[PDB]
Design a protein around this nucleic acid. Structure first.
Lengths: 1313, 453
RNA sequence: GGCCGUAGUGCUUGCUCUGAGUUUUAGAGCUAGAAAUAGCAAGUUAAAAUAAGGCUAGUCCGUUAUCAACUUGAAAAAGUGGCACCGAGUCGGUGCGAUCGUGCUCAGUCUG
DNA sequence: GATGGCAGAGTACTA
DNA sequence: TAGTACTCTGCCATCAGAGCAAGCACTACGGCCGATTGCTC
């Protein structure tokens, strides 16, 4: 028995641990080794770290699941269409659908003719000649009036149904509205006809160009307003223009309606909103609104169709056909021109599939952008290519019909085309006449997002409820699925429970009871002072009732002067329903509070007007039709944090009064909610405690999963808990005195590119157009800052140069000393940092005044954030006050993250469980949380420099230092337990600046005593004479238990790319009947775990049984089949007479010990990884740090000079470091060629400065590291990977099974078996 | 010839004993006492084969009888320190805790030898073989002491129970003491001259002349013979001036130390571990009464006993060890005290350590009764010289309150301090009550005692 | 630490959708050459699959999390491994290892 | 982004 | 000599978007939320 402490450092993919005694010494005990080897004991130190792969989020899995569901539903759509057509297709051509199904089949595998549509070569070729693309057939079906072949009709309908289009636009679309200028003129004419007093003139304005601009909608609206006289923004005409272009305008000011009456044209509720607005104002604005709708349709369609729709009913098909024709004509012209001018490149352009060009564009995988990039110089270096170059620049050259840009086609266009086809062809086909509605429903049906998957009790994700048990098709979806209950369940499965009552749901935020509770809590804390009062007094219950009834129940906002005049002088959600229902007695009644709660709950739950109106029908008799309509119109959003049971259900045992009752009738006490729930005499605390007891706690894993944070962080937390339990068991079941823990603080280029594009479009500038920047280039911090700042200086009014970059300075708005934030939200690029003014405060007031307008413009452009703007303009608010500086200084040392608090709570609950007589928990184990700043400052002050490239020992060293520093701190300052242990401005500033000054011998010059004592007690908390020596000795130990957590791989079967057919055994069939050698398939399967199998195989013609020992990779796909029957699985592979007892399961990162301490980790069934760590001496570590200038220089000039002299005198350490690396590699790594190349590079680069040599030598440890081999670079020379692609040698090594700490081992010698 | 005369008293001829006077005794149980049954722990082949012969012969004597009881405790063999006999031990750990607690009326070894007067020079020490087995056990309480036993060789399985008081039971020394005391109470009446000393089961008879001892011996052999108790003839010092009792030598009415005990202390080599020093200090702690001022002699070794420390055997430590080795070589002969007499307490201090000898009148000389030594508590040890004597006299007189049996005694000291106690310029009030009690405490003439003796 | 008020940012979980991409087949290549080969012509589209697959047969589920070895259990789960000192190249060496009273030393708690 | 699969070129031992 | 058989080197990996809902964590402010003992009227 000995008092000890556990120190932990938690990372995203590492957890270091350390056990120390009172004298800050790491213990060491012998550990028994189990297994068949001759080694029966081993000595290890209680210091080490656990490494694991980072956890992942369920985002990719969720996306995959949605994609699977989408494919299933698409096949179901095609099946529905086939079911409709089946009888007539059987009459016409019986094998049509069978031929369609087996199109993906080689000739010998098809049971029908290879030609899938007509079945004979003459007809197939004739059809393909007549209709080169599907759009030709679709247009022919739309326009022609005579009979059409049924198979052709099915093909067109199937294409339309299979590829519908986006559902972003709600309502109906009329493709006939195509001209923008004509519709704008018609709108202006209607506006002038109605508003006769103030006519509007818009002649001579390029309405088409202005409205169809590529800028933002707001920018286009502003441009149109500027280029239009007689009106501006927020006017009637401006609001009409905004509504047409898509913005949501407020028509309140136009007609003085006093209500918002906002209309959004693409929303489903637009018709109802327009009806309400028309009923409010009049029926003469219907023409104007209809004109706006037509203009909106034209605006949204003209950007896509780009074709004349006055002669055809299929504008999209006509556009695709014209695209086909332009492609053909341009292709012919290009062929002729290339033949005329450069016949020698004709082969590489029109025949070579590897290189980009036409061959790679059509036959190959080259995209449109790559094709344009290849073909631009050739077109420029030719004559007669002006129009082709124009088309290339506008991205309209040689376009295929199916492209990425087709994502902007609404499904309404396809619906109109399908309707036209059905109308044309229903005369000859009565079945087409009958099933028109259901075909359109097939096209336009999509499951509501609140309904969810249509399961039947075997899905964890589903929540839907069926009113009838029968198959759900799109035609009886309404009659089978209970939409109201489904939506209510959809909302309720995600909302929170009350924390005080874990089994009670929270109230809506706008609930009447919630409003009363918040208002009463606010009111009970106002102490009025007036004449004739000796002392301030609190409002009584009746006085509060009078105030609420007289002020709050009358006007929305209540102010102090109103309270004094209407109450102190005159005598001495609720408002939304008052103007809707026009009933005061109903709202003030007490037997209808349930009705009011139901109403607000319905409005909060349901977002669809039909759902709200069908839910409110039970209360229709209470109100009138117009009242019901207004109620449907109003909708609330938000959920509270308090439950109705807590607010009003529970009652005090002594008085039988609820919390709201007490709050109303507080009287002189005026106790608010927190006082009520913390009162000891009152039973509220007891009842809350009783409720929280029910349920208790789930498993540790369940609790950690329920925690909020990153999955990697949660995985690290679970691993830390497990290692804590393991260490407690190791130390003899004795709990430690203290547990000191710490936690580290922590396509992006595509996001940056989209953000800068949006900001530039909003601002109207053309900086990107001046010189485009790629995402990889935009990843640079200086370039990103320059582009975000619109190319202008942020502290003074001047222009920066992109070509002059890498020369300015990045200045943080908040000084780095006060806050260590390196984010873009705090970094600012300016020509000179001195423009900000003082370097220890916010930028100067003059600069703030100068650049306030520019910063406001940037904020409006979303280039900078609100927090950044507030920090920038803090000088106007007052700058950084002394209290702010003190708070910033203090918060750098005291941990405040909720994730760290959760970790501390979990460990504390696990460790301390006993209770006193008064049910007070005894704090046997004290859990301390520190920030990394304290330990890093300790390292910098006392020469314990850390270099992460050497090895993984720094995790264990960090844990040890965490324990030492935390224990010493709580020993020296017992008064700091409040802010560390889980359970004035000048005075506070200088207290936390010198909290760690008791470690050092000298301060600033103060001769601090050698022995540190607690004070008021005879406790030695530190001893500068020997404790520094002890820490140095602990940091220099060569043995540290580093363990890589073995895992069984799970996830995708293999690479998702489908390779073409090839005669290889590695290909995997995509379906059971599809042979890879004839159809292609996947490759690179993922290995779940290797299995050691000792069996016999048939070798040679005689099939003699040769004894074989080998590793077999059980891939993820076949893991379940292997587990179901290992004997059959192994025999099918070719092995005979296998041994079940000798079968050994080998997960990833399994450790093998071969010879001379050489260790290999199983990367897969055919690869290995390094498993040895280099224990470089601390003298070499410090020399490398000092010579490399980690984090530049952060020392005084006097101390900076002496360190350089130290490096100069110790120049020769580089050769010794190289010698250490070489001998470690020769003994373990065994990469002779790479070692020779590294030595040659070092020898040739001997004359370069010590700084450069140390910086490049730091890279050399990549050669001698733990884990997968990686390529590094020494100066110019690059050294590739030396992969170990042979698992033959490990069959005679020792397999080590390590526990979570590595102290418990089971060595199994595979040589014997 | 002694064995022939009393065939009913010697165990080698009289066979098994049985208390023919004491009734069967019921062993009570506390409220939560329950019949806990523990399975017989695994035992080695040879181990079982060691107890096995004993069970066969214990069955013949009737000690072990088959029974069916809810109570069951695991038997456990303990091999002897020499050779290998594998003695049987009942291992009544759990039942011992649960049995109702009864006060331990046993006489403490400090005070038995105090009753022996130097006038009675002839001794006769009689051992009582299978003493705890003499008392019979009530069949109601017999199920309490059953233990599981398996003997496939003779096919005897089940739980054998004790019909007599077993060993390893917490109330056995107590229940036998009172039982034996009543039987011998009548014997003491008939022979007032004889002095009978009883320690648990060991009885010592002290007489004036040799014939009295012989006559007493014969009578005792017969009284115990009728009572059923059997005396061991192998180890029975009868009518010898030199006898060994309570680990002491009683020669010429004095208390010596066994020469074998002295050899063991000197025999051990220099200790090297805290366990090694703990064995030596405890072993020599028995002989602390013979070495005057031993506390000061073994002072350096005391701080080395602390669990948290470094075992540095410095030259001073070796000097302390050598002093104890040499001190035990020439240990004097402590005399037997006399209750029917006054005591004289000599007290002295030097450097925070109190030392003294309790003596009584023997002829014209003073004979030491016990050498008392204690360390002065820190606050007292810090005081100036002429009051550190007050604390010195106090702690030594406190030790006297355990050997004098509360008899009045006189205290003499080089400095008259009784008046200081009355008017000393909480604890002192406690000191005043003890020191000023004229009934038990008195201050004698001032004198200076010998620095060594 | 919680709950109001405003505002913002980031992230998470779940659902419903869209566009492409990939693979095989269909879209008759011609001519001169025995053949390789050469010369021309042509190219834009469609069908099907989109983790193998599973049973619970649903317009459902299938890539998240969890998982050293051994023993006991169907499983969930529970158990399995002596200590001190001197050292340090991935850890080594050396040494030790049922009760009742009485003596000694020491610790903790409570009270004043 | 990184790390394991895979094709292909290269060299070596055996039947 | 042909045929396996092991080794080294370079290439390579499905990707973009649209809504909706609930929640947490942090920033930045601006207000409200102990109990006991000693002294004084």
């Amino acid at each position: 028995d000995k008092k000890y402490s556990i120190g932990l450092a938690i990372g995203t993919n590492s957890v270091g641990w350390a056990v120390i005694t009172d004298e800050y010494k790491v213990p060491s005990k012998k550990f028994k080794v189990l297994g068949n080897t001759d080694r029966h004991s081993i000595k290890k130190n209680l210091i080490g770290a656990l490494l694991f792969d980072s956890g992942e989020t369920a985002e990719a899995t969720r996306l995959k699941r949605t994609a699977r569901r989408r494919y299933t539903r698409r096949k179901n759509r095609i099946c529905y269409l086939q079911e409709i057509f089946s009888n007539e297709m059987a009459k016409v051509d019986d094998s049509f659908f069978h031929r369609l199904e087996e199109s993906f089949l080689v000739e010998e595998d098809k049971k029908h003719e290879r030609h899938p549509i007509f079945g004979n070569i003459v007809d197939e070729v004739a059809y393909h000649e007549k209709y080169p693309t599907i759009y030709h057939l679709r247009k022919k079906l739309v326009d022609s009036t005579d009979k059409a072949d049924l198979r052709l009709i099915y093909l067109a309908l199937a294409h339309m149904i299979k590829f519908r289009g986006h559902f972003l636009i709600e309502g109906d679309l009329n493709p006939d509205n195509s001209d923008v200028d004509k519709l704008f003129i018609q709108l202006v004419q209607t506006y002038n006809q109605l508003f006769e007093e103030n006519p509007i003139n818009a002649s001579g304005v390029d309405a088409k160009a202005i409205l169809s601009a590529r800028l933002s909608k707001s920018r286009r609206l502003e441009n149109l307003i500027a280029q239009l006289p007689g009106e501006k923004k927020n006017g009637l005409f401006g609001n009409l223009i905004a509504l047409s272009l898509g913005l949501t305008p407020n028509f309140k000011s136009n007609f003085d309606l006093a209500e918002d009456a906002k209309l959004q044209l693409s929303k489903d509720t637009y018709d109802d909103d327009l009806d309400n607005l028309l009923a409010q104002i009049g029926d003469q604005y219907a023409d104007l609104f209809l004109a706006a709708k037509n203009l909106s349709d034209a605006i949204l369609l003209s950007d896509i169709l780009r074709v004349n729709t006055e002669i055809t009913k299929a504008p999209l098909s006509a556009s695709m056909i014209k695209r086909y024709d332009e492609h053909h004509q341009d292709l012919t012209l290009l062929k002729a021109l290339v033949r005329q001018q450069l016949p020698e490149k004709y082969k590489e352009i029109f025949f070579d599939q590897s290189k980009n060009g036409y061959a790679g564009y059509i036959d190959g995988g080259a995209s449109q952008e790559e094709f344009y990039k290849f073909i631009k110089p050739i077109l420029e270096k030719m004559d007669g290519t002006e129009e082709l170059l124009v088309k290339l620049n506008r991205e309209d050259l040689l376009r295929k019909q199916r492209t990425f840009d087709n994502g902007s086609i609404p499904h309404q266009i396809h619906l109109g085309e399908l309707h036209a086809i059905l109308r044309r062809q229903e005369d000859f086909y009565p079945f087409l006449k009958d099933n028109r509605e259901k075909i359109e429903k097939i096209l336009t049906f999509r499951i509501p997002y609140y309904v969810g998957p249509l399961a039947r009790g075997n899905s964890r994700f589903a929540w839907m409820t069926r009113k009838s048990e029968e198959t759900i098709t799109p035609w009886n979806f309404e009659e089978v699925v209970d939409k109201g209950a489904s939506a209510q369940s959809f909302i309720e499965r995600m909302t929170n429970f009350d924390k005080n009552l874990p089994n009670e749901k929270v109230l809506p935020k706008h609930s009447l009871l919630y409003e009363y509770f918040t208002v009463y809590n606010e009111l009970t804390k106002v102490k009025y002072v007036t004449e004739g009062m000796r002392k301030p007094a609190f409002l009584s219950g009746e006085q509060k009732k009078a105030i609420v009834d007289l002020l709050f129940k009358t006007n929305r906002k209540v102010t102090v002067k109103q309270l004094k005049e209407d109450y102190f002088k005159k005598i001495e959600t609720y408002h939304d329903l008052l103007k809707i229902i026009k009933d005061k007695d109903f709202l003030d009644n007490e037997e209808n509070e349930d009705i009011l709660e139901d109403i607000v709950l319905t409005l909060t739950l349901f977002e669809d007007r039909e759902m709200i109106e069908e839910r409110l029908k039970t209360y229709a008799h209470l109100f009138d039709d117009k009242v019901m309509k207004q109620l449907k119109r109003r909708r609330y959003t938000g959920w509270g944090r308090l439950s109705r049971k807590l607010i009003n259900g529970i009652r005090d045992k002594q008085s039988g009064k609820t919390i709201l009752d007490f709050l109303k009738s507080d009287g002189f006490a005026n106790r608010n909610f927190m006082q009520l729930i913390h009162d000891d005499s009152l039973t509220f605390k007891e009842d809350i405690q009783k409720a929280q007891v029910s349920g208790q706690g789930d498993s540790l894993h369940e609790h950690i999963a329920n925690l909020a944070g990153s999955p990697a962080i949660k995985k690290g937390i679970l691993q830390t808990v497990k290692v804590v339990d393991e260490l407690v068991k190791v130390m003899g079941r004795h709990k430690p005195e203290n547990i000191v823990i710490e936690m580290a603080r922590e396509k992006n280029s595509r996001e940056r590119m989209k953000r800068i594009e949006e900001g530039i479009k909003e601002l109207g500038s053309q900086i990107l157009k001046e010189h485009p920047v790629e995402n990889t280039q935009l990843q640079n911090e200086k370039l990103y800052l320059y582009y975000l700042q619109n190319g202008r200086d942020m502290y003074v009014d001047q222009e920066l140069d992109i070509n002059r970059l890498s020369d300015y300075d990045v200045d943080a708005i908040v000084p780095q000393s006060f806050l260590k934030d390196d984010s873009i939200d705090n970094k600012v690029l300016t020509r000179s940092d001195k423009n900000r003014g003082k370097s220890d405060n916010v930028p100067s007031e003059e600069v703030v005044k100068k650049m306030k307008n520019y910063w406001r413009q940037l904020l409006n452009a979303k280039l900078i954030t609100q927090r950044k703007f507030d920090n920038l303009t803090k000088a106007e608010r007052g700058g950084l006050s002394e209290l702010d500086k003190a708070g910033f200084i203090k918060r750098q040392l005291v941990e405040t993250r909720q994730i760290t608090k959760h970790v501390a709570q979990i460990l504390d609950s696990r460790m301390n469980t006993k209770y006193d007589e008064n049910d007070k928990l005894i704090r046997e184990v004290k859990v301390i949380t520190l920030k990394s700043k304290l330990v890093s400052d300790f390292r910098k002050d006392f020469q314990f420099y850390k270099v992460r490239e050497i090895n993984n020992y720094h995790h264990a060293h960090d844990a040890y230092l965490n324990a030492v520093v935390g224990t010493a701190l709580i020993k020296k300052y017992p008064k700091l337990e409040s802010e560390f242990v889980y359970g004035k401005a000048t005075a506070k500033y200088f207290f936390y600046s010198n909290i760690m000054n008791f470690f050092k011998t000298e301060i600033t010059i103060r001769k601090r005593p050698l022995i540190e004592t607690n004070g008021e007690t005879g406790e030695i908390v530190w001893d500068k004479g020997r404790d520094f020596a002890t820490v140095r000795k602990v940091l220099s130990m060569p043995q540290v238990n580093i363990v890589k957590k073995t895992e069984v791989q799970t996830g995708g079967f293999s690479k998702e790319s489908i390779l073409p057919k090839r005669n290889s055994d590695k290909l995997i069939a995509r379906k059971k009947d599809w042979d890879p050698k004839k159809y292609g398939g996947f490759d690179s399967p993922t290995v779940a775990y290797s299995v050691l199998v000792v069996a016999k195989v048939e070798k040679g013609k005689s099939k003699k049984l040769k004894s074989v020992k080998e590793l077999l990779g059980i891939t993820i796909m076949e893991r379940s089949s292997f587990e179901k029957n290992p004997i059959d699985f192994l025999e099918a592979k070719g092995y005979k007479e296998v041994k079940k007892d000798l079968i050994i399961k080998l997960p990833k990162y399994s450790l093998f010990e071969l010879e001379n301490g050489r260790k290999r980790m199983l990367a897969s069934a055919g690869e290995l990884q390094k498993g040895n760590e280099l224990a470089l001496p601390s003298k070499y570590v410090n020399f490398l740090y000092l010579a490399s200038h980690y984090e530049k220089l952060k020392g005084s000039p006097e101390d900076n000079e002496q360190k350089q002299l130290f490096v100069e005198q110790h120049k020769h350490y580089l050769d010794e470091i190289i010698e250490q690396i070489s001998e470690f590699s020769k003994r373990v790594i065994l990469a002779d060629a790479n070692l020779d190349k590294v030595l040659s590079a070092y020898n040739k680069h001997r004359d370069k400065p010590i700084r450069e040599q140390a910086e490049n030598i730091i890279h050399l440890f990549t050669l001698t590291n733990l884990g997968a081999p990686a390529a590094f670079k020494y100066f110019d020379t690059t050294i590739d990977r030396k992969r170990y692609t042979s698992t033959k040698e490990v069959l005679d090594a020792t397999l080590i099974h390590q526990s979570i700490t590595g102290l418990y081992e089971t060595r199994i010698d595979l040589s014997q078996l | 010839t002694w064995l022939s005369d009393f065939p009913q008293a010697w165990a080698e001829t009289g066979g098994m004993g049985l208390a023919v006077r004491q009734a069967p005794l019921i062993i009570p149980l506390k409220a939560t006492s329950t019949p806990v049954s523990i399975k017989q722990y695994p035992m080695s082949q040879e181990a079982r084969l060691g107890i096995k012969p004993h069970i066969q012969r214990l069955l013949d004597q009737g000690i072990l009888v088959p029974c069916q009881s809810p109570w069951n405790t695991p038997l456990l063999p303990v091999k002897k320190p020499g050779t290998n006999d594998y003695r049987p031990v009942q291992d009544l750990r759990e039942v011992n805790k649960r049995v109702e607690d009864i006060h331990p009326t046993v006489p403490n070894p400090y005070n038995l030898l105090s009753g022996l007067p130097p006038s009675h020079q002839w001794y006769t020490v009689l051992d009582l073989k299978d003493a705890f087995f003499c008392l019979r056990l009530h069949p109601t309480s017999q199920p309490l002491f059953a233990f599981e036993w398996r003997d496939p060789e003779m096919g005897i399985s089940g739980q054998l129970t004790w019909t007599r008081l077993p060993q390893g039971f917490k109330n056995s020394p107590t229940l036998f003491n009172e039982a034996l005391h009543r039987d011998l109470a009548d014997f003491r009446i008939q022979h007032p001259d004889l002095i009978l000393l009883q320690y648990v089961d060991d009885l010592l008879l002290a007489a004036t002349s040799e014939l009295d001892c012989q006559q007493g011996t014969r009578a005792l052999l017969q009284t115990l013979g009728n009572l059923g108790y059997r005396a061991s003839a192998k180890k029975a010092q009868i009518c010898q001036k030199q006898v060994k009792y309570l680990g002491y030598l009683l020669k010429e009415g004095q208390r010596w130390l066994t020469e074998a005990r002295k050899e063991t202390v000197m025999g051990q080599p220099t200790p090297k571990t805290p366990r090694q020093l703990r064995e030596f200090l405890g072993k020599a702690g028995f002989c602390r009464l013979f070495i005057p001022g031993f506390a000061e002699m073994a002072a350096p070794l005391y701080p080395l006993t602390k669990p948290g420390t470094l075992f540095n055997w410095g030259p001073d430590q070796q000097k302390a060890y050598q002093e104890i080795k040499q001190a035990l070589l020439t240990a004097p002969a402590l005399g037997l005290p006399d209750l029917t007499k006054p005591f004289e307490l000599f007290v002295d201090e030097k450097q925070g350590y109190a030392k003294g000898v309790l003596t009584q009148k023997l002829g014209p000389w003073r004979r030491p009764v016990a050498y008392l030594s204690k360390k002065l508590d820190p606050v007292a040890a810090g005081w100036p010289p002429c009051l550190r004597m007050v604390a010195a006299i106090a702690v030594l007189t406190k030790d006297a309150g355990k050997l004098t049996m509360g008899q009045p005694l006189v205290i003499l000291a080089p400095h008259a301090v009784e008046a200081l106690v009355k008017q000393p310029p909480a604890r002192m009030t406690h000191y005043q009550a003890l020191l000023l009690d004229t009934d038990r405490v008195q201050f004698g003439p001032v004198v200076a005692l010998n620095p060594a003796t």
